[PDB]
Design a protein around this nucleic acid. Sequence first.
RNA 1: CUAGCUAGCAGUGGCGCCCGAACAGGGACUUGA
Lengths: 542, 402
Amino acid sequence: PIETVPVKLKPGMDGPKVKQWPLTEEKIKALVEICTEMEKEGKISKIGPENPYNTPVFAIKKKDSTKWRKLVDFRELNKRTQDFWEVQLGIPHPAGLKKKKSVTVLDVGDAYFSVPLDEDFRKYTAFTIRYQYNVLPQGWKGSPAIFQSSMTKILEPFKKQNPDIVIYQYMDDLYVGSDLEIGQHRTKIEELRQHLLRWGLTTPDKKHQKEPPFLWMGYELHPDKWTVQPIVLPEKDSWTVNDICKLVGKLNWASQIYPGIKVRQLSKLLRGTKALTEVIPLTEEAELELAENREILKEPVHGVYYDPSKDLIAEIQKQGQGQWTYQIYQEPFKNLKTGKYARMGAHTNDVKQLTEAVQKITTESIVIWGKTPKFKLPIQKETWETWWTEYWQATWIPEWEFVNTPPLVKLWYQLEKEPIVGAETFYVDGAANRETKLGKAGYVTNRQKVVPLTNTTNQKTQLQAIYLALQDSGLEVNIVTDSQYALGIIQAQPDKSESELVNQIIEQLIKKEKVYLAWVPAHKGIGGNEQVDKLVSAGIRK
Amino acid sequence: IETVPVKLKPMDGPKVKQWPLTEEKIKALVEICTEMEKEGKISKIGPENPYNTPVFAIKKDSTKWRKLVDFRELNKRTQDFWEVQLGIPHPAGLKKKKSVTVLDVGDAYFSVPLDEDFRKYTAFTIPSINNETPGIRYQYNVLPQGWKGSPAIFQSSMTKILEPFKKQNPDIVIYQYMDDLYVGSDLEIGQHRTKIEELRQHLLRWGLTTPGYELHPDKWTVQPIVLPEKDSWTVNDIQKLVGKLNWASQIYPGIKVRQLSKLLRGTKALTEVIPLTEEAELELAENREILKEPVHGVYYDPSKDLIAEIQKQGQGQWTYQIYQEPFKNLKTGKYANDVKQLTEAVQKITTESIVIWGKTPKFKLPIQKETWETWWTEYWQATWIPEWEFVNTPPLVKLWYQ
RNA sequence: CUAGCUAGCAGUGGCGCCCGAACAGGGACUUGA
């Protein structure tokens, strides 16, 4: 007796007029009998000579080969149907589950058909062969939404009856548990079964409740622990994009829970691959990466549940190469889960990636648990405070502490906000042409230099000019330039980027203990500015 | 009640997602929505409507947990109605007053019905931690908060009820931009508070509970761009000053470095001092006297859009700039954890812009998007929500101040 | 109605590829240094 939901069609539209495909002559009886069986149960209405519409029909023999069953496609109507709200856009996670002593689960077969449909909308079920589904059909756009809404409003009174219990619902299964003995659990289960039969559902008393760990999206939901489904890997040499997809998906499902999982190499191996049977020669790096992932996978591990009373902890063990990690635990070595964050702006630093990873982990913890723990970062306070105080942005983080777990994080150099005595002034500049690209550039002392280039832009010309200048300068220096590009880039104090040019820049800068820099306009006649402009513009300006 | 028919521009309603929340906020949301539905203000719904609007929780002066909605998109789409049909004026004496006061009468909006054909465009849902439960959707059966159409339609009865006192206090001025209110007061702070309490009683007469607080516009002026006055001038300082002057020339056309550029004709070291000739000193003093003067050749347009830029210096020191067109500044100033200060600063700047022009500008914050989206709710205390974005800043506009 | 008279549906999670929409810079028209 549940109440349906009023539903209409898109602005000024109607049911699509179509002709049902011609089919075989052996499934017809085998599917006409299925149609009559669905009819006799009191779930469909057959009214053909009135409805001037039509819908497609299909006969399928899917997995568990027993017979040719029926199927229907709404691809022609799903778009014509009025828009609806997609309720479930995410999924739960094993790490965010709690400690329920008496666990259970409840599924219902054909439950989709166990819900009526608005009779004004049931007219759009012209299942010719005619049959008009008196209940929700399959493959529908929003049917799961109405399903979950009905389930929620039906359990609402049950929740009011026993609010202390928690429920984890899903598409068709009802994962539920408590912290009591068996007797009371089964009493409440029978109470729920009656509360549901009040509206016509199904529930047996021989399903899988302790035989688990369950089989849910490839998980192992043990009673007092959990982990992903036991995984394997092929042991051949050739690697086709299909086997790639397979092992990549497997190791990704495993990486979200397992530590020390690297896929960057195998990911890079895919960029540019488009065919369907590419036997890729596994580079030595990818080979050793797979070997290490195997070694880590050669021994199993069981995740831990969550405890609301006791807090949690966050920690990281970086591996290098700009890649990061993170571990979540409530007690030493009781790792809940882990992951990976190694996305690179063309230029970046260590503390920037650290901040991004920690804020992403904070968002993850909030969406999972709803709060953030005290972080354990391998970097001292003075570095972070100086960074975010002298940086051109604002970055805040919750309480945390220091960790003496090498390797660590730091700034491999620093900049001075005031000139220095004894240093040397360097009026430098560099330009090029949009056609020849043979820009000349160099430096000037308070001795000048000029060096042509090849296939470079004014930005890159000035970059290489300051590079070659630093290659010959000493320790202390007070340089000036005009390109705000390179200045602003260096102000970020990066130690890694994509272009190897800036990498050599920072490499040479490391050795230089002291350095100062600033910005000035161009074409104004400031000391050596016009001098270098004239010297480099030789043969390229006119 | 005669619900005015609301009709969106012949553009569909929004269906924005909902960022994650915390149980400490979900409990407050549930316990307040229970009473909200008990009092016929809202009702439970299903997926019949595709729309959805953000929702969140907040926490000065109390420990309660109020709420509001992000009608930014809704307002940007339904502008025409309240912008043209029933507009509102904007006085100018309020800024010439001594002190002011800001109120909030959302409860008044919570005491009126609302049309039914427009509620579907008010879809607001709460999240579920770890996706354990589907979205518990609801609908606004009454006038919501933050929607500037509700005040636009309620102003009639509002003024009809305000009639008694304003005749006795003609010097006072009132503005109704949103759920919040304002007052004109050019008298003693004690008298200001006495009249504020009188108006609070006039409101309580109909059951309106409403216990920073005040503010003063007289102190607000422009931030004079000032240069250093030293007895010994090195090179680096002159270079920084020349860069600043060249970057600011877009504001004051009367800026030149003729007498200064000559001193730069000699490429020397940085620590060496150079004397400032009378001609150079004369031009420097002229430029200084020109800077302190206000802007000449600008105005304000209520039809166009507004921009609210922001920067940072250090030690919790911040700046801010407002303008419609690039380099056409209408106001400057100064204002001095790192996100709390930013939130209160943007609040202060928007309040200033509203009391000056009666409109909320667009912002430009130097921070990533996810960090702000996550941490802006922590220290927020107002009930109005403006637009915003995120931008990268070079170390040039920073030279507007030290 | 998708593939060469014949076989042909959707959802979930992932692996991806193409396009559209946003962000920062480069080449042509118009103003100033």
